[PDB]
mmCIF file of C-alpha atoms in Angstrom:
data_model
loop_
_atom_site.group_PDB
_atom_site.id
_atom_site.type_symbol
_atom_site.label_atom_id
_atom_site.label_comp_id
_atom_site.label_asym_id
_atom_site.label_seq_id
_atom_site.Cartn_x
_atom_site.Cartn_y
_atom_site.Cartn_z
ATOM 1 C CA UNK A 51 0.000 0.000 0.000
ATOM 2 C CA UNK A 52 1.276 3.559 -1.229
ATOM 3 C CA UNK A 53 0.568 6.925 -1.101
ATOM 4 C CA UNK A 54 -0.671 7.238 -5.020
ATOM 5 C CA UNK A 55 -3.437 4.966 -3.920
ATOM 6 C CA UNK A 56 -5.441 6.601 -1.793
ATOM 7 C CA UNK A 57 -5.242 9.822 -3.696
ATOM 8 C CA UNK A 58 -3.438 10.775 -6.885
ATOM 9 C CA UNK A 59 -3.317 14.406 -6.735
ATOM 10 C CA UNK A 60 -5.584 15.272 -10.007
ATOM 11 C CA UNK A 61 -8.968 15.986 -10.021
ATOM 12 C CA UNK A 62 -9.456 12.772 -12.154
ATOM 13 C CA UNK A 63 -9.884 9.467 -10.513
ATOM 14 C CA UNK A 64 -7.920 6.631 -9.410
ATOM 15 C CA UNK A 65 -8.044 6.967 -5.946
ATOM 16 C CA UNK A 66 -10.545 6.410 -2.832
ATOM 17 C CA UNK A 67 -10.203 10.028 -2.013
ATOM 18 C CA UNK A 68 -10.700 11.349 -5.691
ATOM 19 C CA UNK A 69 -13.645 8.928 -6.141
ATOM 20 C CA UNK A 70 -15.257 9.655 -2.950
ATOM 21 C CA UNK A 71 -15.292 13.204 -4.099
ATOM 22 C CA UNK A 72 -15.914 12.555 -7.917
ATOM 23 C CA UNK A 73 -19.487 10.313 -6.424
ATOM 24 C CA UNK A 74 -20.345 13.326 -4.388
ATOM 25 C CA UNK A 75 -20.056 15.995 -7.371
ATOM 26 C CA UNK A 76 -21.723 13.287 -9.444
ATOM 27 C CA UNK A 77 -24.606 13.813 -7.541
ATOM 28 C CA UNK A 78 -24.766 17.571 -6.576
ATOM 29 C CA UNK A 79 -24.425 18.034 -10.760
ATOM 30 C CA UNK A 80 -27.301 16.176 -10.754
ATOM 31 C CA UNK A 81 -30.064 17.707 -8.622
ATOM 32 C CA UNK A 82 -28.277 20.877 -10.416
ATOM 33 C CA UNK A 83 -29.304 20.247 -13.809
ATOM 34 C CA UNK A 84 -32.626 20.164 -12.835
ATOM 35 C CA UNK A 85 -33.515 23.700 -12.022
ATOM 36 C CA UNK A 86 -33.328 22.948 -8.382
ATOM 37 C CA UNK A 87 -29.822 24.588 -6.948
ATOM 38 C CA UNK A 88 -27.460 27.029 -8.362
ATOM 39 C CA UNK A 89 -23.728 26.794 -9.083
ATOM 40 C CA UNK A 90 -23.244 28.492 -4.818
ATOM 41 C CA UNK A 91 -24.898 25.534 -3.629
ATOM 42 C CA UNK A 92 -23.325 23.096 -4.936
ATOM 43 C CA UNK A 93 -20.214 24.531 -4.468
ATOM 44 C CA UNK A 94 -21.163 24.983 -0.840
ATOM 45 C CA UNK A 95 -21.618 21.474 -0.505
ATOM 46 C CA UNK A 96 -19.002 20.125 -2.092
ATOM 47 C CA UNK A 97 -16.221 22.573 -0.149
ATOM 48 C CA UNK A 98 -18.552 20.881 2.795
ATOM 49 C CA UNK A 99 -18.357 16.962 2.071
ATOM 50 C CA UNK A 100 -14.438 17.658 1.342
ATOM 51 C CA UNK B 1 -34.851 45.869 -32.353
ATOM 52 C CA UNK B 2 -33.117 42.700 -32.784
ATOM 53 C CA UNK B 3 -34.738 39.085 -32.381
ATOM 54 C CA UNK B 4 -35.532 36.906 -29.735
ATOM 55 C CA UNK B 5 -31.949 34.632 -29.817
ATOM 56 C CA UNK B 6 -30.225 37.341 -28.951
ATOM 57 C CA UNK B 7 -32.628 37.947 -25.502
ATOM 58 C CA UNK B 8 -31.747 33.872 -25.156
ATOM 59 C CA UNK B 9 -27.869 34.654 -25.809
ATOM 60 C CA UNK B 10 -27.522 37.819 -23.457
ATOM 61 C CA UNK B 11 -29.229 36.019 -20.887
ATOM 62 C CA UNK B 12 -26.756 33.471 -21.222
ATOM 63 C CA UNK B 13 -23.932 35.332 -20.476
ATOM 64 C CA UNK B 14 -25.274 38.444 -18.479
ATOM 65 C CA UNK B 15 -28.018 37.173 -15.464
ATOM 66 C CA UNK B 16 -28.813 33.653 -15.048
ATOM 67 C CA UNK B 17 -25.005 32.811 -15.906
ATOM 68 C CA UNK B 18 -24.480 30.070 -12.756
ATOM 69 C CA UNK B 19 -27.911 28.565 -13.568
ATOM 70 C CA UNK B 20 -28.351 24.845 -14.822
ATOM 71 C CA UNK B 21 -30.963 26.079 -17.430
ATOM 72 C CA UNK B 22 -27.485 27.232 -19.610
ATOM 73 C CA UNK B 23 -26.230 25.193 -22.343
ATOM 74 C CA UNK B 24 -22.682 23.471 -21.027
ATOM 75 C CA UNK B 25 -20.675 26.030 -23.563
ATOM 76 C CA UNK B 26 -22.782 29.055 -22.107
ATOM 77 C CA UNK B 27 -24.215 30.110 -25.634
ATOM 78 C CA UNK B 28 -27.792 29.686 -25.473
ATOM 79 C CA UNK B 29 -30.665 28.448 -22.839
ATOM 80 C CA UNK B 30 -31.527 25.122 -23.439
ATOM 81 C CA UNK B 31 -34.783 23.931 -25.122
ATOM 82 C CA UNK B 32 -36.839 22.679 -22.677
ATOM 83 C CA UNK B 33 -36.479 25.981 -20.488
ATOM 84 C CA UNK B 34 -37.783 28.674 -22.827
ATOM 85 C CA UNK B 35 -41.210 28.790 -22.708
ATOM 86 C CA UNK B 36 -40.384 30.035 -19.085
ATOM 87 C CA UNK B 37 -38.417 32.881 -20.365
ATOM 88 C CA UNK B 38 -40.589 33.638 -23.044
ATOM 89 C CA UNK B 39 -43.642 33.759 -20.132
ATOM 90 C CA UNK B 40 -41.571 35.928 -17.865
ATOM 91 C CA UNK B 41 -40.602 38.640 -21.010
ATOM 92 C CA UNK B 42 -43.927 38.663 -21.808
ATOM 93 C CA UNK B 43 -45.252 39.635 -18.277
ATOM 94 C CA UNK B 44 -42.320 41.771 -18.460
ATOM 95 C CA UNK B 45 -42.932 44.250 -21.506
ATOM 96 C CA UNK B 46 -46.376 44.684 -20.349
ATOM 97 C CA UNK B 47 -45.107 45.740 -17.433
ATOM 98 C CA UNK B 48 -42.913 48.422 -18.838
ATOM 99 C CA UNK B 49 -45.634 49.268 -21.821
ATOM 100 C CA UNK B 50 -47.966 49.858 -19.205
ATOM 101 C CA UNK B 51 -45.712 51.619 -16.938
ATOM 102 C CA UNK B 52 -44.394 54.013 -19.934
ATOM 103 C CA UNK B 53 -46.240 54.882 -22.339
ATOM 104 C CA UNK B 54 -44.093 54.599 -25.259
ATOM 105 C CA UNK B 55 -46.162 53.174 -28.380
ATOM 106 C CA UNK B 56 -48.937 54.994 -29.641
ATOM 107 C CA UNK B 57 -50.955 53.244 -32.154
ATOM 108 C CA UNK B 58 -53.925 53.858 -34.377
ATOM 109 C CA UNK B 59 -56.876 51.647 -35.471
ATOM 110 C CA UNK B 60 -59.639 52.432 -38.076
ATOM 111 C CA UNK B 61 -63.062 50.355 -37.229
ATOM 112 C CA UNK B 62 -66.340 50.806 -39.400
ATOM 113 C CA UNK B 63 -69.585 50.680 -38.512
ATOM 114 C CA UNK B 64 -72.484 47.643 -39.432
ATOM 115 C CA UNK B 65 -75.933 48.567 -39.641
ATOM 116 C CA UNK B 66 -77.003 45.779 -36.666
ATOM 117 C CA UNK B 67 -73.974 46.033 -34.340
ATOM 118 C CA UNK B 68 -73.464 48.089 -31.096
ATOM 119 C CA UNK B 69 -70.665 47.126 -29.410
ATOM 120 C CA UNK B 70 -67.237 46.704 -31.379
ATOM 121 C CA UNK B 71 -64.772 44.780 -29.248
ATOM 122 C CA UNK B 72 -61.086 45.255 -30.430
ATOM 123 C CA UNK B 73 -60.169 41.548 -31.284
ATOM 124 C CA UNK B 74 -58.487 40.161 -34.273
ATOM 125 C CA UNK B 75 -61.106 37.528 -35.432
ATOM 126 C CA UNK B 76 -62.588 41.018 -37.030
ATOM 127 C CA UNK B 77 -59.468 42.104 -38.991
ATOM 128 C CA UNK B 78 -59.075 41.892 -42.297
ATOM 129 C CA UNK B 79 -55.504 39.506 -42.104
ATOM 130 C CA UNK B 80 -56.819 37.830 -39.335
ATOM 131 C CA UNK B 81 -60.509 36.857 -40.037
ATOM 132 C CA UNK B 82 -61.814 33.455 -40.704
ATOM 133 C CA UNK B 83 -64.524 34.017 -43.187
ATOM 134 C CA UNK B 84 -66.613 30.844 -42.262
ATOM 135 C CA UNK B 85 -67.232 32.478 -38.680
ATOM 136 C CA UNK B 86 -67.373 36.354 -39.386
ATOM 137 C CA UNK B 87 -68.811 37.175 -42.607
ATOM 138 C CA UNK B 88 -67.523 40.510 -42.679
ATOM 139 C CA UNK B 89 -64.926 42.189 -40.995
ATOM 140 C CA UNK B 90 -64.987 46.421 -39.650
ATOM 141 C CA UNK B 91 -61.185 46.561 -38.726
ATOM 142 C CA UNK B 92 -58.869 47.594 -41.234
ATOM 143 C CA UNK B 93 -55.629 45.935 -42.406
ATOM 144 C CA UNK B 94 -54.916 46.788 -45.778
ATOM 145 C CA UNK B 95 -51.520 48.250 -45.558
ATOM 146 C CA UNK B 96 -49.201 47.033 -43.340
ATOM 147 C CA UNK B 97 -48.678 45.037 -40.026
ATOM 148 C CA UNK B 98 -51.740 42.459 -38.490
ATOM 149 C CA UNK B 99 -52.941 44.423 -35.651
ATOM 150 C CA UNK B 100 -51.716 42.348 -33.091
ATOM 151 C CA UNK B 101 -54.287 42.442 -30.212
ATOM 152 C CA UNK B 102 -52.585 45.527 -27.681
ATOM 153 C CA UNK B 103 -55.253 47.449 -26.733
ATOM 154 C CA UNK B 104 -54.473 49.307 -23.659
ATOM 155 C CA UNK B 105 -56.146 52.537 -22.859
ATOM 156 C CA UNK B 106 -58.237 54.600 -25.701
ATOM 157 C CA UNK B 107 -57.983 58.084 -25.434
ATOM 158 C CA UNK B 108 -59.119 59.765 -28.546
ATOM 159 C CA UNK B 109 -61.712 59.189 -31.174
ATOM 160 C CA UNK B 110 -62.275 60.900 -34.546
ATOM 161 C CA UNK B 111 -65.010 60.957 -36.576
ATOM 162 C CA UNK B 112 -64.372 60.374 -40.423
ATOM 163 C CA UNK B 113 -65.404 63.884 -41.026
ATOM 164 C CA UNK B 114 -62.681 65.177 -39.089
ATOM 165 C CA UNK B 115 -64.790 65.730 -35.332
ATOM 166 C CA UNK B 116 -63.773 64.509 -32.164
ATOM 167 C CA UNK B 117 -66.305 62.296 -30.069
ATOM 168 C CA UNK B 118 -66.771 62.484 -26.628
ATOM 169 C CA UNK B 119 -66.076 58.965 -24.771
ATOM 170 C CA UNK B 120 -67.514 57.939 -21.223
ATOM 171 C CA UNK B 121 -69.292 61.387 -20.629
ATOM 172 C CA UNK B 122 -72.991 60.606 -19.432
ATOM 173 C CA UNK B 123 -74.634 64.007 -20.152
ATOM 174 C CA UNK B 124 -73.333 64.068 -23.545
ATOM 175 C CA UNK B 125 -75.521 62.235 -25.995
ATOM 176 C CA UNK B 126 -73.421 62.194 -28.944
ATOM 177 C CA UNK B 127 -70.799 60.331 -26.640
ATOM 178 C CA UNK B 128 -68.946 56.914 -26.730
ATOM 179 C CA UNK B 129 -69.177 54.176 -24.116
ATOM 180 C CA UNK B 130 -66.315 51.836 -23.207
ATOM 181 C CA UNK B 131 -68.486 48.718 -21.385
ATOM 182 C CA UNK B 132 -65.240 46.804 -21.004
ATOM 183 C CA UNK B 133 -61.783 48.214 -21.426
ATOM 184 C CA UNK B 134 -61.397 47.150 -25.063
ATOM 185 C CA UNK B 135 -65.199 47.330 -26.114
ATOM 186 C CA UNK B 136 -66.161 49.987 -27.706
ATOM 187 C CA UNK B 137 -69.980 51.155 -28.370
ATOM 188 C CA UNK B 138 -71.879 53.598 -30.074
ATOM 189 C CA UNK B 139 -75.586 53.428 -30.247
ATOM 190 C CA UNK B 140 -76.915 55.200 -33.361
ATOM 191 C CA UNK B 141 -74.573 53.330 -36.112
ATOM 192 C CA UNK B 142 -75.082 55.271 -39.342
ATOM 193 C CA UNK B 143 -74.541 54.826 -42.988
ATOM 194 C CA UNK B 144 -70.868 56.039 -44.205
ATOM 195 C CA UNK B 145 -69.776 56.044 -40.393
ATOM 196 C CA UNK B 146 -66.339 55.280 -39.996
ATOM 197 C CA UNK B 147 -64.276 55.752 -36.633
ATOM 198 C CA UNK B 148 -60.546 55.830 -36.083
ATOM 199 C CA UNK B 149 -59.196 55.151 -32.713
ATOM 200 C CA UNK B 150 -56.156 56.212 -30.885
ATOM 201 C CA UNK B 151 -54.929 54.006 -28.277
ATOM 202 C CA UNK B 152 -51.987 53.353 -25.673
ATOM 203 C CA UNK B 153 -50.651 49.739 -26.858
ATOM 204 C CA UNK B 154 -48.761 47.375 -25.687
ATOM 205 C CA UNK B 155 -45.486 44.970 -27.499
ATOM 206 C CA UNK B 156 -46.991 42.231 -29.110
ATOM 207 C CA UNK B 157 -46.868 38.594 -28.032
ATOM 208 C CA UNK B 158 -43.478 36.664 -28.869
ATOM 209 C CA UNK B 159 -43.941 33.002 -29.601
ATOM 210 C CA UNK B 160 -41.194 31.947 -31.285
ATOM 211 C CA UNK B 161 -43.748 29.127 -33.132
ATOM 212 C CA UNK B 162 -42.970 30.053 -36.557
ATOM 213 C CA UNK B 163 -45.754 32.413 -36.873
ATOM 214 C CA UNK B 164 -45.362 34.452 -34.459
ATOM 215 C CA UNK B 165 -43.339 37.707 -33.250
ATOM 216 C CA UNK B 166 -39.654 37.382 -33.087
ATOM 217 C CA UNK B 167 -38.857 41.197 -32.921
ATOM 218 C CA UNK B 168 -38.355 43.295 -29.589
ATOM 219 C CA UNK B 169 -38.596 46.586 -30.120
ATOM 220 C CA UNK B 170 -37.933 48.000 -26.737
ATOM 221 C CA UNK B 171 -35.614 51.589 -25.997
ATOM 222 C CA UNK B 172 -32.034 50.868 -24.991
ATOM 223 C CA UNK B 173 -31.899 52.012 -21.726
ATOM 224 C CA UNK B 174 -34.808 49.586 -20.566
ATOM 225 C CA UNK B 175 -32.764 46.344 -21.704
ATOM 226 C CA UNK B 176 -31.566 45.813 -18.013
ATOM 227 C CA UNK B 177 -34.976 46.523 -16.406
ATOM 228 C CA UNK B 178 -36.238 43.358 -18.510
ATOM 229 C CA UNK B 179 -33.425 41.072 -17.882
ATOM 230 C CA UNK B 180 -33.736 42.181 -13.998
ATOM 231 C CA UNK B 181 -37.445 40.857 -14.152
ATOM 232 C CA UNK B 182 -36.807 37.778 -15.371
ATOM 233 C CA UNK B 183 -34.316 37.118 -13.130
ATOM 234 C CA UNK B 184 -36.669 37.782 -10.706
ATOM 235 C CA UNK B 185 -38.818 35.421 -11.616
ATOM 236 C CA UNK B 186 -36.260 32.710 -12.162
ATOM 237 C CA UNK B 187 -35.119 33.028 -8.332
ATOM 238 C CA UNK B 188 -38.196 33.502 -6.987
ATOM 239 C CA UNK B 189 -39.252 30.044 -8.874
ATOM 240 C CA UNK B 190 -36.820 28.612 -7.061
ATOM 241 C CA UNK B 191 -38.199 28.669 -3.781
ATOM 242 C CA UNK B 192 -34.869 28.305 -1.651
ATOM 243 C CA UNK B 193 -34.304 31.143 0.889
ATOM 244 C CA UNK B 194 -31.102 32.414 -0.907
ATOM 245 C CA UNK B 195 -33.007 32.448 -3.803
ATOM 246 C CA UNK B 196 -35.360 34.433 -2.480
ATOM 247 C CA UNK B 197 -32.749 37.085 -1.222
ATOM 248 C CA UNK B 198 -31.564 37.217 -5.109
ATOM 249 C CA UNK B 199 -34.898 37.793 -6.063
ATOM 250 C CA UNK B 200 -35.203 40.391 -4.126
ATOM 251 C CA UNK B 201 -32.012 41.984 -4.815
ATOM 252 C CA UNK B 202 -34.005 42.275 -8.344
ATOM 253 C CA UNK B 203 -37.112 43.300 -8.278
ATOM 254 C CA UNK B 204 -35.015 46.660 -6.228
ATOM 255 C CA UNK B 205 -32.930 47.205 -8.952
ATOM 256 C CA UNK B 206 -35.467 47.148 -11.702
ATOM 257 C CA UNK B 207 -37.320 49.345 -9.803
ATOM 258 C CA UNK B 208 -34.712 51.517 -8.945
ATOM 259 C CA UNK B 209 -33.782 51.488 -12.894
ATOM 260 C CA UNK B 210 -37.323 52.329 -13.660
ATOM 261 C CA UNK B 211 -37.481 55.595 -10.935
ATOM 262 C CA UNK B 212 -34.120 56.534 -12.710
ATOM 263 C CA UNK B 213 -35.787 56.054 -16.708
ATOM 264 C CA UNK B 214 -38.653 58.702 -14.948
ATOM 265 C CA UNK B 215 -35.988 61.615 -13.193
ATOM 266 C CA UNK B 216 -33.946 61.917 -16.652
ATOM 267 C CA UNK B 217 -36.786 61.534 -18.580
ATOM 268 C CA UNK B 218 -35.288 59.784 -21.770
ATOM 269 C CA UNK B 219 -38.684 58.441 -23.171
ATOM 270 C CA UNK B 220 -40.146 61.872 -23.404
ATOM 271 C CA UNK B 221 -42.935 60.924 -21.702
ATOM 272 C CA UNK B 222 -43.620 64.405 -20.244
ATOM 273 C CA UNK B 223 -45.724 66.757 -22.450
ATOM 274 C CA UNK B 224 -46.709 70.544 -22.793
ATOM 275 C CA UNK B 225 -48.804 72.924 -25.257
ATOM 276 C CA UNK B 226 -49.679 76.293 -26.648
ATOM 277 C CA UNK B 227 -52.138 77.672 -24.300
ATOM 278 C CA UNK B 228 -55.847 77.756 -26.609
ATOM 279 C CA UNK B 229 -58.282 78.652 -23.484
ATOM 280 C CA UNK B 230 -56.951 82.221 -23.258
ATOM 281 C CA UNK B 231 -58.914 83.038 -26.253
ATOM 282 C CA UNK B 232 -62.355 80.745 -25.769
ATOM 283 C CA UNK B 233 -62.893 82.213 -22.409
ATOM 284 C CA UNK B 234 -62.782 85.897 -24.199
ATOM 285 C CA UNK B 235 -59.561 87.433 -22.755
ATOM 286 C CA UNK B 236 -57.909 90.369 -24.718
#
């Protein structure tokens, strides 16, 4: 077990820590593309599950 | 004076820009969200059309034998009429543009000899009734008679159907006042209590634009004249 596999440094993937995060804004983008939240929310909430 | 995709693409990048109703390359609003901004633009301009008073139109009706009240609809113009339902029509097309259906406020009526006729004055029996705001009577129609009305009118519907009005025609400064409304109604739609706050962030400033549009007075909506009652009342 290494460093570069719990998180990779990039925004991508391959990582528990990048796909932890990447599920999250997966679903935020979600309810946001229905005219439910704006772009503050979800940012909010994201910054918040971080 | 320019169409309605460029009211989608300025919304797209002015107002509205965080929203979820934007296209991904933030270029126009996506399809299945415009009927809501065509709703809110509508409520919008007759908003500021009422508010303003910037259009003044004209409309020339004639006068059936049988009829007493004349209501100001299309079915009854001449580019508009179905003949199976109305045999004949008394509003006048012939020229140019369909007489979309904008009728405000009347406030003046002229004979087709060249005389004014009183409207809504009781004690006056050569006068003209108004039963409902866009209704118009008189009740001795005569043979010849022909009346031409001057109104206070509103923009006409946009429907973006293929038939319908593409064109705003709105003055320059009162672009911002529009896209404030709609924003307003966007955020308000929302119901979220930031949301809320936003919305009312813009119904202030559309306001406050408005208040602004009437201390300059840019539309000229202020009015004077030569004095004429010096001479009826006999002065020398």
């Amino acid at each position: 077990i290494t460093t570069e596999q719990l998180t990779t440094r990039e925004v991508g993937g391959s990582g528990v820590f990048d796909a932890l995060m990447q599920s999250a804004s997966n679903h935020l983008l979600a309810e946001f593309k229905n005219n439910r939240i704006t772009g503050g929310d979800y940012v909010k909430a994201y910054i918040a599950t971080m | 004076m320019y169409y309605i995709e460029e009211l989608f693409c300025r919304l797209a990048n002015g107002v509205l820009n965080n929203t979820g109703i934007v296209t991904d390359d933030r270029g126009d609003i996506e399809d299945d969200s415009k009927p809501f901004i065509i709703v809110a633009a509508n409520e919008a301009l007759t908003r500021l059309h009422g508010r303003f008073n910037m259009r003044n139109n004209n409309v020339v009706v004639e006068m059936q034998e049988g009829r007493t009240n004349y209501p100001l609809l299309a079915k009854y113009a001449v580019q508009s009429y179905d003949p199976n339902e109305v045999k004949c029509p008394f509003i006048m097309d012939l020229a140019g543009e369909k007489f979309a259906e904008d009728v405000i406020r009347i406030l003046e009526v002229y004979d087709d000899k060249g005389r004014r006729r009183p409207l809504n004055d009781r004690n006056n029996p050569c006068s003209l009734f108004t039963p409902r705001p866009n209704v118009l009577q008189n009740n001795a129609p005569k043979a010849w008679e022909v009346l031409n009305v001057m109104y206070q009118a509103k923009h006409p519907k946009l429907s973006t159907a293929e038939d319908g009005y593409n064109e705003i025609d709105i003055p320059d400064t009162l672009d911002p006042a529009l896209d404030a409304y709609i924003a307003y109604r966007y955020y308000t739609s929302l119901n979220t209590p930031e949301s809320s706050a936003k919305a009312a962030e813009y119904l202030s400033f559309y306001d406050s634009i408005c208040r602004e549009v009437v201390e300059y007075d840019l539309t000229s909506d202020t009015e004077v004249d030569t004095n004429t009652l010096f001479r009826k009342r006999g002065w020398r």
